[PDB]
């Protein structure tokens, strides 16, 4: 009766920035989705390819939990075939994505009157991300034809930006913690069921 | 890379820090206006300075992306806003002098005062002293004191400054490729778009004149009616064929004849509709006032106020020691933060104000998806017209009855209908010739068409000819009576109120025809008309992203200022004036003066 480490991911005190989104491999445990309680206001639970309605009786080889924080406007982008600064440059899900995307408003946790600059997102990237790619590069974005010399300048911008969360922000700019449960099926033992 | 793609990315990095600093300012600016402390005053000016600093820097960086190579309007209109230099085109000599003059005129206006000839120790500041005199005194001489005293003890002090202000503003405009400072102000309405949605700066001149030439019939019969109902009081002081004395018009300048209503109400017996008593009798509070306004917009398909609106706004005077200048404000701070700063009292006028101010929020919320520099009214008059039609709909007996304020008693009569429209006309119709004439004067002043040794002489010639208003005291060139009005002294364009007034009735009429409204336009409540709300959102959500000529068309179906909706709003009063002026002189001889 080995309980899966979901309390680690959802209930963590600090979430990763979306650009440097954190993945937590989950294996050899009973997956208790049943207690993935409705955490916070504006709760969002979206599943693709498989049904969350108590279809725990399925087993999966490995189950990856990808967590990060984005603003409410960008939760729609954590879905197959979506475009935007997050889906293009920060976190991309495949077209054939089989999993679930969970999202709750975390304004009470991740905002600050002075602005929480801890959460970042990639604003610039010469290419969009292949599915589940992570880009933590901090190389200056060379918008221009002149080389940037690794320092911010004209036509040379830092690729990341801060969300600068303030509790007063509108719902569209408030922080939303997101956890993406990718379910993997290989010709493999399939060690994660959970009754 | 291309000078457009480079522009986009630059605007991306600008739109990030701007939206950051603009928020920081708006909050720090909100925290002062709701806490008024010298400490929060520093933070407000500091965040305002970091914001101004960034904008000034980015303006310079932006000019390096030539607009001639931009095709995307979302980039062009964004770049155009940032690229405009302003006073930063003058030498630091001229700029430091221009600021010195501007801050001087603003200080001379506020700190200035006029003293009684009877009581030379009663040096009364305009706000609130001389304003109480102009707005309430029925005494000819007490009104004559303040009017002449203000235009002398303040208006003369501004005369040398305004002469310099016109010169230093011209040099700023000409160096920014504008004919004069007036053509610079008219550039707000300039749209260089395709599809016949273009608009020239000079087209505003013709348009404002041509539309005024149709307000003239309304104004004359309002004038002859005001002149007659005025002539009852001040009897020997107002000629039956002459112009109106300027000090007898309500406001210190005659901007709003709103306060002539006690002396001009058609059927004074029939009481005004005041649901203020009905609100107290139902234990209404400020939150209820705004919840009803929220329900109003929701009825017409607009979103409710955000949660951050209810838990951040100041809908009541805070109290304690927390001073807050009680004046309605609608805050688009940014990052989805929408707030209203209002010392709401449970009255009808604050109820109507709450809808008006919440209209601003609906406009601010609608275009929040627009790029930051485009998050604004389609032009300077759009944002105010959207607010005004919110009080127009909410003030009708229909809306008051459906919300339980005015009892289910189907009130109204052919007399109270005339009373309200007369009250409206004093405010809305009365200001238009005042606004056109004042701004026409500045345009000719800036154009150079009026020599300085004839400024006042040409001003009062225009006042008599166009506004039908004459000075009680002759004024030589030591006066600068226009400068005795706030916007003139404080360097604010004024054709906004003219244009906004025309717009709001174009707005209201278009929405009311959408609303299947049967009957007079002034009785129209757009409530529950989700078809009208959609055409509104189609324009509201545009912001400044598209020309006002086109944005106006997404509501009213015309590319320009049409005054006929305004006339149709007052046709009931127009016909009733033509009869109550049948035996009266409609017009004015410009040579009559109360000083012989
Ligand atoms: C209205 O404004 C005043 C001052 O502008 C606010 O007073 C500040 O209140 C906060 C929280 O109550 C205090 O932390 C703050 O004191 C800080 O600053 C001083 C130096 O100024 C510092 O030495 C302290 O250690 C502390 O960090 C108060 N500052 C002042 C100057 O009074 C007040 O909260 C505001 N209230 C509202 C309702 O807006
Ligand atoms: C987080 O903690 C609460 C309180 O104990 C619990 O109900 C919830 O299941 C926890 N979340 C996860 C993912 O375990
Ligand atoms: C620009 O608009 C004006 C009216 O605003 C119109 O008269 C003029 O024809 C337009 N420009 C051109 C080149 O036609
Ligand atoms: C907000 O407006 C919607 C739209 O009609 C309405 O259904 C909803 O009830 C409103 N909000 C609340 C809290 O009632
Ligand atoms: C609008 O709808 C409400 C109920 O939704 C109704 O009571 C009211 O009479 C309608 N009309 C107006 C003008 O409010
Ligand atoms: Zn307003």
Numbering used by the authors:
A (entry chain B): 333 to 527
B (entry chain A): 19 to 614
Sentences from the paper on this structure:
The Omicron variant of SARS-CoV-2 carries multiple unusual mutations, particularly in the receptor-binding domain (RBD) of the spike (S) protein. There are 15 amino acid (AA) substitutions in the receptor binding domain (RBD) of the S protein, nine of which are located at the binding interface of the SARS-CoV-2 RBD and human ACE2 (hACE2) receptor, namely K417N, G446S, S477N, E484A, Q493R, G496S, Q498R, N501Y, and Y505H. Receptor binding is the key step for SARS-CoV-2 infection. Omicron BA.1 was found to display a broader host range than the prototype, whereas the Delta variant showed no alteration.
